Amino acid sequence: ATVYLPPVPVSKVVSTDEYVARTNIYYHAGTSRLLAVGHPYFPIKKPNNNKILVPKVSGLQYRVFRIHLPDPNKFGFPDTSFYNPDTQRLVWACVGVEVGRGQPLGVGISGHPLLNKLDDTENASAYAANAGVDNRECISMDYKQTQLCLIGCKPPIGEHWGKGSPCTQVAVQPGDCPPLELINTVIQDGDMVDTGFGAMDFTTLQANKSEVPLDICTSICKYPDYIKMVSEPYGDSLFFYLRREQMFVRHLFNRAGTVGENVPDDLYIKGSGSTANLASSNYFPTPSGSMVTSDAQIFNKPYWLQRAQGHNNGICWGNQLFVTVVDTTRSTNMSLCAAISTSETTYKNTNFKEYLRHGEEYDLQFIFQLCKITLTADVMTYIHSMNSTILEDWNFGLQPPPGGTLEDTYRFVTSQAIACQKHTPPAPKEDPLKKYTFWEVNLKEKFSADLDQFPLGRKFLLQLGLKAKPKFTLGKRK
Amino acid sequence: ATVYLPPVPVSKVVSTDEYVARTNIYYHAGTSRLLAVGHPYFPIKKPNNNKILV
């Protein structure tokens, strides 16, 4: 520049598929399986202390991993360089991923010993059974079936309705629901999916703090904010998503507690008896999970990334991948027991102490394409306007210093002081993370160049070149 | 100093086959019917001997 920052773009934003050439050099990577054994309901901590002994792990929460990748320009190379390192720079493209489940078919389960529930109002049994002191019951559910996986390279955006706070312009008091304002935030590991009360916080909306389970009270519940993400052309925040979700209405119920609502008292006619009074108009549909089937598994089959939502196809502008997984369908909870004493020789429920765990597996197989971004002066100006940090990291002119001189604290040694001594010694240092809240997967040298002996690999050779297998695949008929 | 430095690859082992030439001679076999009729709730064993009753 000038002209001008550039032009044009904006408008029309140049794709990274017009000057970023693919190469036929392939490396292969994968993980060694991942296993995390939690307690979905709550983490089990030592209550004499504050540290976890069993974490919280669940498929009914987002499992969001921050994958850090090498860069090809760190290599000594096996000789993948035939040109000057300043006419081009190298970046990865990920062209296939399979995300495996090692968990059997069967659901996980959540519940609450005191879920806020009055009476049954699907078909009556009461108007109220209580409006004084207590009325909550032992009730469990498995939250709705959600399967989705989505892949990006910058952090995903979630939406949820946060607490818009009661206003005093229009009459809303405590004991009236607030106006609700949508407060959107990054999808991060440990966070709960939508429950079908809407996707909202429950940490400060809830004030009994015991309407719902131990798990969702203490999370933010979120719905994916597809909408802002698919409107970024580049799609660096995601360049792949899919979903399958469903839920059915188990039974209508009424919440524990009295109306806070204002009912116009002129939309009915008064009765006599039971029909004189009103129940609480705080009806809620009770939701419940769906039937699990092996034809609903979007997993253990490969998601290609040869093409992507974004201009991005896994192109490294940080050398990171974000992979978010939800699987509620193999999120088996396995039940077990240990006997408290062998002093009790009869069957007692004060003898054999039931315990639940959830075991969580994930494996990710990856095929990596080596790609290049060819740099001319004009290209370099576009990137500079785009994100300057990329140029510096690559290393590219024009840098000051010099620099110099003197220094201080001279001779001796100490020696007393003299001399100097100021002293004064440097670097706190401080501070931004940039962690933020993710299950760290380091890949740096799991990279390969054979892909005939990885299962993903074999299928990728089949798809790409129509060879090699190596001998044969399938049937026939069968 | 790094390491990596490709090499790379990991890894390449021999194909089970690549030179299996299928002869046009074929044979057939079979079993007559394999059957078993048990008890689905529990093995019924004879306690005096050690052998199944069902």
Q: Taking CB atoms and an 8 Å cut-off, how many pairs form between chains A and B?
A: 50
Name the residue of chain B whose CA is nearest to A76's CA. Answer: B5
- Pairing outcome for strands A137-141 and A180-182: unpaired
Q: Which of B8, B18, B20 sits opposite A470 (nearest CB)?
A: B18
Partners of A449 on chain B (C-beta within 8 Å) are: 6, 8-9
Query: Å from B31 to nearest chain A CA?
Result: 21
The minimum CA-CA distance between B4 and chain A, rounded to whole Å, is: 5
Parallel, antiparallel, or unpaired: how do β-strands A52-54 and A302-304 relate? Answer: unpaired
Residues of A in contact with B20 (CB under 8 A): 471
Phi, psi of A48 (to 5 degrees): -95, -5
8 Å CB contact of A78 and B7: yes
Taking alpha carbons only, the member of A71, A90, A70 closest to residue A444 is: A70
What residue of A is the nearest CA neighbor of B7?
A78
DSSP designation for B19: -
How crowded is residue A117: how many other Cβ atoms within 10 Å of its Cβ?
19
Paired residues of A302 in beta bridges: A98
Q: Whole-angstrom Cα distance, residue A382 to residue A376?
A: 10
